[PDB]
């Protein structure tokens with residue numbers, strides 16, 4: 001969860017990307033916009049003789 | 050015969066000829082996968098980066 005500069009409309013709560021997953025949320029206690037990024041990943045390869 | 054257009058140009062950082070530079074400028078290579086190295090993707094921007 002990272003701080004974001006998205007300009008939410010006052011009636012809007014959640015934000016959606018192209019794939020229709022949740023990308024930006026609004027914190028319900030303090031009115032702040034948070035971006036959701038998936039955690040770090042990648043491929044693993046083994047080079048061996 | 051003049052071969053200066055297809056012979057390599059040492060002034061360029063990558064040793065490519067004038068016609069090769071023209072072709073590389075004509076093709077817009079949009080599939081740059083591992084150039085990002087996931088750091089620029091981890092820094093999230095409001096613009097929709099494909």
Ligand SMILES: *[C@@H]1O[C@H](CO)[C@@H](O[C@@H]2O[C@H](CO)[C@@H](O)[C@H](O)[C@H]2NC(C)=O)[C@H](O)[C@H]1NC(C)=O
Pocket residue numbers: 051052053
């Ligand atoms: C062979 O062709 C090249 C390119 O046409 C000539 O080199 C010069 O190239 C520049 C562009 O980088 C042109 O603006 C110049 O007009 C070209 N000529 C000169 C005299 O500078 C090169 O001279 C040609 N060589 C021969 C033997 O024909």
Ligand SMILES: *[C@@H]1O[C@H](CO)[C@@H](O)[C@H](O)[C@H]1NC(C)=O
Pocket residue numbers: 005006007008095
């Ligand atoms: C809305 O647009 C203005 C100017 O067009 C820009 O400064 C601002 O950052 C935008 N808000 C966003 C991208 O959330």
Ligand SMILES: *[C@@H]1O[C@H](CO)[C@@H](O)[C@H](O)[C@H]1NC(C)=O
Pocket residue numbers: 028029030031
């Ligand atoms: C309760 O929610 C309101 C809504 O904005 C907020 O201003 C206030 O700080 C919250 N109080 C606590 C104790 O979290």
